[PDB]
Amino acid sequence: NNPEYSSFFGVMGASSAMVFSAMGAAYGTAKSGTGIAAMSVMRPELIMKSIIPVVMAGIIAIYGLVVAVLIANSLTDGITLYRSFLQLGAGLSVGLSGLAAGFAIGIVGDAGVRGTAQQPRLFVGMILILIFAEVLGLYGLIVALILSTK
Amino acid sequence: LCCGPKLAACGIVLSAWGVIMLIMLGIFFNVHSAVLIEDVPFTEKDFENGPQNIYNLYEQVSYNCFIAAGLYLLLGGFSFCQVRLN
Amino acid sequence: RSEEMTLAQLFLQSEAAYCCVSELGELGKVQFRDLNPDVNVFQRKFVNEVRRCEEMDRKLRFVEKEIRKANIPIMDTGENPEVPFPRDMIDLEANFEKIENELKEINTNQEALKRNFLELTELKFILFVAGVINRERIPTFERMLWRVCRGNVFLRQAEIENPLEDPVTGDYVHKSVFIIFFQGDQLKNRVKKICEGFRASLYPCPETPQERKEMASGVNTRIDDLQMVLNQTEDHRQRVLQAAAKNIRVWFIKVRKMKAIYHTLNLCNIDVTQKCLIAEVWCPVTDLDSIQFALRRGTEHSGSTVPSILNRMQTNQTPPTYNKTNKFTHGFQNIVDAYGIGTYREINPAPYTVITFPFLFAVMFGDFGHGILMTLFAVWMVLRESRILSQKHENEMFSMVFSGRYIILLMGLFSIYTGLIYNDCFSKSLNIFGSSWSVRPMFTQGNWTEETLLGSSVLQLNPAIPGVFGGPYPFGIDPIWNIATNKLTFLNSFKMKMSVILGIIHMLFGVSLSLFNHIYFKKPLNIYFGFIPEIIFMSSLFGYLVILIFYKWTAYDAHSSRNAPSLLIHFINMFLFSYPESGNAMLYSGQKGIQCFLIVVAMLCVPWMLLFKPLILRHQYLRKKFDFGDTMVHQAIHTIEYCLGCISNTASYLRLWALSLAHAQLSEVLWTMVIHIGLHVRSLAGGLGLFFIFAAFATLTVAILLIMEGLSAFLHALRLHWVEFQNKFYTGTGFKFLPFSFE
Amino acid sequence: TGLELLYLGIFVAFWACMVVVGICYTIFDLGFRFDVAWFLTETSPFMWSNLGIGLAISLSVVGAAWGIYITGSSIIGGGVKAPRIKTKNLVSIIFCEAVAIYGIIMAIVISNMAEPFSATEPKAIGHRNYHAGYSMFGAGLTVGLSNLFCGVCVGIVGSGAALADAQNPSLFVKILIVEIFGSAIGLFGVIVAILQTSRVKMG
Amino acid sequence: SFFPELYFNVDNGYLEGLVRGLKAGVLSQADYLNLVQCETLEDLKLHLQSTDYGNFLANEASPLTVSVIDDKLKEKMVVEFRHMRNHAYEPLASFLDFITYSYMIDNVILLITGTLHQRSIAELVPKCHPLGSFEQMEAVNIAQTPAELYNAILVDTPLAAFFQDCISEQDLDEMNIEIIRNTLYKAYLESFYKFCTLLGGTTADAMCPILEFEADRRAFIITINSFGTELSKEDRAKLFPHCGRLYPEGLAQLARADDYEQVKNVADYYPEYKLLFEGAGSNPGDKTLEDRFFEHEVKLNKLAFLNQFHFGVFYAFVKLKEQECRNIVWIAECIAQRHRAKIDNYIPIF
């Protein structure tokens, strides 16, 4: 019947959904913190104002968690290679979309905090670009669902 | 005075939301017996005998919508009292 | 036409023109323009007054800063002042000069504080030289001591926990004391060069042995302490003078007012012949009589007793725009202007957006309980309008949310309905119990009995159409999907088709408006050979997809599941012109001719816009007798941009599906991970746990979905309302009004 | 050179070992065990197919992220002293995300034709299955890499345009042409991928 | 896919935009024509308000003097540069450090030559450039021998690296300080050139010509200045930079020079130097060699601003704006002397 290697690949997919995506979020948060430092001394009133990038990093983590739980419930002993490779593909794609989005948000958040530290009118502008970062993560997640059926 | 409303109004809104949704959950678990579409989880493993067990245990599970909401019934009353303390 | 006529000229010289413009700017319905010759800022007929106003403004800014240093607030309850026109203002500023004159005396006596600090150092000298140095410079100091002396001297330090006032800046900067011991006079000489680089000039040079010196220093220190305690009375008079800051804040307000008046008079006309100083103004036609009223107010004060009237004058230039906004539509126009500033005589997109933004948010917010929550939020904010507006707030998030309360309320109300048709309220389906799917003897009639025995470990999809079932649902989406393990496939198909169809229709609505403006501006060349090819191209390409998708939805019955076609394969086939004879069946009879004709006419549409119009422009230019190459370059760039861009916009419409799917999945997981555990076996202590469980669940959904992801969805709606909507007809090249309303 | 020395070392060692083993096999008359057929056949096509499916959006999203950040840093840096350019330069990020849109639609197209089989020996899997797997994997790789480089290119040109636009506000209308000429290759990759995966009939 | 352009912005995008915005603050010819018509210093301030320089004279300068104008201009310089520095990571940080080393050396030699005359001890602080301030700016007043000066500079001031093994002397007279200046500047130019060529990429391509020109400029200046003085020729040969295009004839022809004729006969061999020396004919009505050198310098910096991801848009920028300050000062000087005869001697920029 099916080989015994088959259970390997699928499980590995789950690991990716909780490694790569997570790592991206981590970078984002770190970078944003540095920005806050450069902005804390001169414009002290806007510390909480800059709560917006850090949460917008953590959301990437959330996405990873979602898919991980799903691929922890579709795993059974008797899995054919077809299902295993579907699940591996989903995990890889979501992890990498999370990673790329994380890098983008981190850089944009540094630039945003630094820009607002000297120009209040820039605030809204930075927010706009930040959205274009976060949405990228969602695109990865999309195919995950498409790969839980076909 | 003690426990000024500035840090407790969110508590009152949360308590109101909790009590209303818990009453709703209990009512739709008891009267409608929580039809399986609105409820996957149950409490047994051997259900090869008949329907009396399923509805009986559904009533037992809905009964648990009591202290749950009752807990707030009170917490809301306490938080309103703290709000009154000016 | 957002306006008829603004650019006019309705001024004349008067002996007291200042009050004329004061009343005109109180009225706040003008915007001046003049100074075409560009005579420089540094030679103006009204320069000296502007200069002296600048001087007074800097000086009162100085006193304002100084009183702010003393932490004395300002009473901002005063009413709007009245313009003090006459030259006597300057003399009154001389009175105000007196104020700051005594202020200067205070700063002189602040140097007296030096002496206080002086004695204070000797206090810590109760502990061959010693001195007081900055704390933060200890390490470089002691390294320098290592370099110069090589350890032959020794140092020991101490520090005072209280921070020490600064004689010069007043800061509580850290300070410290150091004692250095030597062995000879050469060190006593050489060390002062290093010590003076670290600001220590208050030394009790050795006079007597330790005991007698200690007693003498103690005695003198207490005497001088009593002296400074006596002489510190200057603070009382300083506070007495400082308390008089509040009086002339309204004077500062009117100072700014008449400074701005004189600034406008600087721009005003340069000619002074026959007492004619006419400066051109922008003021909309509907307010013309209002301007006349201001004129009368001028004659209430200006004793020239002249009519001060003048006729309007047309213009060959471009006037600005204006958007009269009522209470309810303020935020929507804020958004639309944030995209850009529309040219004169443009279709204001407010009435469309004001309703298409909640609709789109609902298209990406398909959930009903969260609709109720957002609506409760919005009603809470709205009902306290009078209280909040009459309140002092500080949080900027609260200010922007209170500015967008209208949009928030509308999208909450629409979210409720769209969630209801979604049939996904808090991850469950509101089941009205009208399912008509499976009844037992019907399933046993279709050769299916007691297969659950093997089914205890498998799932057993049922093939549809046993011949006794079906039934759509009037109430939106049939509820049974909410537990079906294959719900994802049908939900995703439905969202795909939903999103594409809505996007195409909304885009058609967007593009269909430009023809109105084209006929309005009377530009025949830009409509006959303009919008017509654009619309025929778009329709022939994508209305075909719409008709095909409805055809597949309506016609292919369940019994023909096999042999059913794939729409995307058909679209790609016609795009590539490949014509396989087998592997996919034609959608309907006569496909070949119609499909071929539509694609060829779509292709033949491009050369019109690509080539024809500039030839006609050159034809008429030559008939008269204009770089023709430039004209076709710009046109061709526009046409290829339109084609590629329209393909990109039609492709970019899937964000609707994306966000809807993310919402669905997130709601399911948020339900089923944390508070799903609330269903348990406990008899007495179960609801106890459910209390905290639901507390955590409610807070987490508040912090994951209600706030931040909703913001992302809202900005995506905004982006769609900007780029793929307004890049079809909205040129966006104009200027708003910068009224002379005083502030 | 700070840490890329490790990468260069791994690369050189790997290729040197590859040359050594290749020549060792060749001169030993032992080439019958270097059966490329065994490697290409006994590996189930599903692994290639799902690798292609993943890559087709992996690379597109990577390119899009690169473009957005490289343009974003410059636009916001320039806007600090020129707020008027803040909104005008959205078009660069629009074009940057267009490649992600193209990538995901390609993933949807490729994802079809995924019918599982039950064959276990190559003769049973068959020519049609092997061709389908290889072709769709290749199409995925092509669209991924093309979209990646299109994204990088448009990001760079958008950065240059945004930097230049802050100076003279009458320059933006004469620099989008390079942007469109960049997006052309991003579309070209998509259409070649379709041309490759046209005739897949896995089963 | 060029070598240096993919990774530049990731940590240097914000500052690049800030500096490029600030480069718009240089005044074109039209503003200079405008500003040459001022009637008094107050007129000059009124015009200065309308330009990007606006609002830095809101003080109590009722008796306005050129001193306050110069001080405020330099204050704007140092505050702007310090803010730019305080937001940079390590590579850009070493770069901006390397920039400020020049002013640091200038300030050190200004202070030592001031204290060489005992008439001034501590009133020399306000003259020194605030930019070139390090923690031991006052140790210079304890050095009786240059060895002691080294011992003062050694610890924290990195200038030690530029003269740690190039100075060996025990007596501190007024002649050798010029040698100190020349050697320190020589080491600074050499180190900066090596750092630039190490940094690699477009920065080297876009900054090598500037440093080369500076090297040759200083070489020629030190040659011409030492004609009729006590400096021996071998020591002069021991003072030229070795990063210019005058490498062979710098050590084989300039050292064998004794009057302006031979310097002309060596400079005319190259095209650009021939043109520069012909333009500066040393006539009574013609500008001296220094003005032509400044003109070429500004031309090179202006040309250097046509590359997107080149670090020196910072360094170049600073130099350029410094020249601008000088220009403004000259104009104000005429307004102090009440004559416009030489008001056109400015050197336009952009």
From Swiss-Prot, chain A:
Which of UniProt's keywords are assigned here?
Answer: Cytoplasmic vesicle, Hydrogen ion transport, Ion transport, Membrane, Synapse, Transmembrane, Transmembrane helix, Transport, Ubl conjugation
Q: What does the UniProt entry say about where the protein is found?
A: Cytoplasmic vesicle, Clathrin-coated vesicle membrane; Cytoplasmic vesicle, Secretory vesicle, Synaptic vesicle membrane
What InterPro entries is this protein classified in?
Answer: ATPase_proteolipid_c-like_dom (IPR002379), ATPase_proteolipid_csu (IPR000245), ATPase_proteolipid_su_C_euk (IPR011555), F/V-ATP_Csub_sf (IPR035921)
Q: Please tell me whether the keyword Ubl conjugation is annotated for this protein.
A: yes
Biological process (GO) annotations held by this record are: lysosomal lumen acidification; positive regulation of Wnt signaling pathway; synaptic vesicle lumen acidification; vacuolar acidification
Record site: Essential for proton translocation: 134
Residue ranges in the Lumenal topological domain are: 72-87, 148-150
Q: Give the matching SUPFAM superfamilies.
A: F1F0 ATP synthase subunit C
The record lists the membrane-crossing segments as: 6-28, 51-71, 88-109, 127-147
The UniProt GO MF terms for this protein read: P-type proton-exporting transporter activity; proton-transporting ATPase activity, rotational mechanism; ubiquitin protein ligase binding
Q: Topological domains (Cytoplasmic): residue ranges?
A: 29-50, 110-126
- Broad class of where this protein is predominantly found: membrane
Which Cys pairs does UniProt list as disulfide-bonded? none
Q: Which domain of life is it from?
A: Eukaryota
The record gives the membrane topology as: Multi-pass membrane protein
Q: Which GO terms describe its cellular component?
A: clathrin-coated vesicle membrane; proton-transporting V-type ATPase complex; proton-transporting V-type ATPase, V0 domain; synaptic vesicle membrane; vacuolar proton-transporting V-type ATPase complex; vacuolar proton-transporting V-type ATPase, V0 domain
Describe the PTM: Ubiquitinated by RNF182, leading to its degradation via the ubiquitin-proteasome pathway.
Q: Which PANTHER family match?
A: V-TYPE PROTON ATPASE PROTEOLIPID SUBUNIT (PTHR10263)
Swiss-Prot record, chain B:
Membrane topology per record:
Multi-pass membrane protein
Q: Please tell me which top-level EC class this enzyme sits in.
A: hydrolase
* Highest taxon of the lineage: Eukaryota
Kindly list the residue ranges recorded as spanning the membrane. 9-29, 61-81
- What keywords were assigned to this record? Cytoplasmic vesicle, Endocytosis, Endonuclease, Hydrogen ion transport, Hydrolase, Ion transport, Membrane, Nuclease, Transmembrane, Transmembrane helix, Transport
Q: Which GO terms describe its cellular component?
A: clathrin-coated vesicle membrane; endomembrane system; vacuolar proton-transporting V-type ATPase, V0 domain
According to its UniProt record, the EC number is 3.1.-.-
Q: Any one Gene Ontology biological process term?
A: endosomal lumen acidification
Q: Does the keyword Transmembrane apply?
A: yes
Q: Which Pfam families match?
A: V-ATPase_su_f
Subunit info? Interacts with the proton translocation complex V0 of the V-ATPase. Interacts with ATP6AP1.
* Main function: Endoribonuclease which preferentially cleaves ApU and ApG phosphodiester bonds. Hydrolyzes UpU bonds at a lower rate. Regulates the activity of vacuolar (H+)-ATPase (V-ATPase) which is responsible for acidifying and maintaining the pH of intracellular compartments. Required at an early stage of receptor-mediated endocytosis.
Task: State what protein this is by name.
Answer: Ribonuclease kappa
Q: Which organism is this protein's natural source?
A: Mus musculus (Mouse)
- The record's gene field reads Rnasek
Curated annotation (Swiss-Prot), chain D:
- Would you kindly state one Gene Ontology biological process term found in this protein's UniProt entry? proton transmembrane transport
Query: Where do the TM regions start and end?
Result: 3-23, 51-71, 90-110, 137-157, 175-195
Name one cellular component (GO) term: endosome
Where does the source fall among the domains of life? Eukaryota
Pfam families (alphabetical)? ATP-synt_C
Functional description taken from the UniProt entry: Proton-conducting pore forming subunit of the V0 complex of vacuolar(H+)-ATPase (V-ATPase), a multisubunit enzyme composed of a peripheral complex (V1) that hydrolyzes ATP and a membrane integral complex (V0) that translocates protons. V-ATPase is responsible for acidifying and maintaining the pH of intracellular compartments and in some cell types, is targeted to the plasma membrane, where it is responsible for acidifying the extracellular environment.
This chain's protein is named V-type proton ATPase 21 kDa proteolipid subunit c''
Q: What is the lineage of its organism?
A: Eukaryota, Metazoa, Chordata, Craniata, Vertebrata
Swiss-Prot record, chain E:
Which organism does this sequence originate in?
A: Mus musculus (Mouse)
Q: Which InterPro entries match?
A: ATPase_csu/dsu_sf, ATPase_V0-cplx_csu/dsu, ATPase_V0-cplx_dsu, V-type_ATPase_csu/dsu, V-type_ATPase_csu/dsu_dom_3
What's a single GO CC term here? apical plasma membrane
Q: What's one GO BP annotation on this UniProt entry?
A: cilium assembly
Phosphoserine modification sites? 282
Described function: Subunit of the V0 complex of vacuolar(H+)-ATPase (V-ATPase), a multisubunit enzyme composed of a peripheral complex (V1) that hydrolyzes ATP and a membrane integral complex (V0) that translocates protons. V-ATPase is responsible for acidifying a variety of intracellular compartments in eukaryotic cells, thus providing most of the energy required for transport processes in the vacuolar system. May play a role in coupling of proton transport and ATP hydrolysis.
Enumerate the Gene3D superfamilies for this protein.
ATP synthase (C/AC39) subunit, domain 3 (1.10.132.50), V-type ATP synthase subunit C domain (1.20.1690.10)
Q: What is this protein called?
A: V-type proton ATPase subunit d 1
Q: What is its main location?
A: membrane
Q: Which top-rank group of organisms is this from?
A: Eukaryota
**Similarity section:** Belongs to the V-ATPase V0D/AC39 subunit family.
One MF annotation (Gene Ontology) recorded for this entry: proton-transporting ATPase activity, rotational mechanism
Sorted alphabetically, which SUPFAM superfamilies does this protein's record hold?
V-type ATP synthase subunit C
What does the entry state regarding organ or tissue expression?
Answer: Ubiquitous.
Compartmental location: Membrane; Lysosome membrane; Cytoplasmic vesicle, Clathrin-coated vesicle membrane
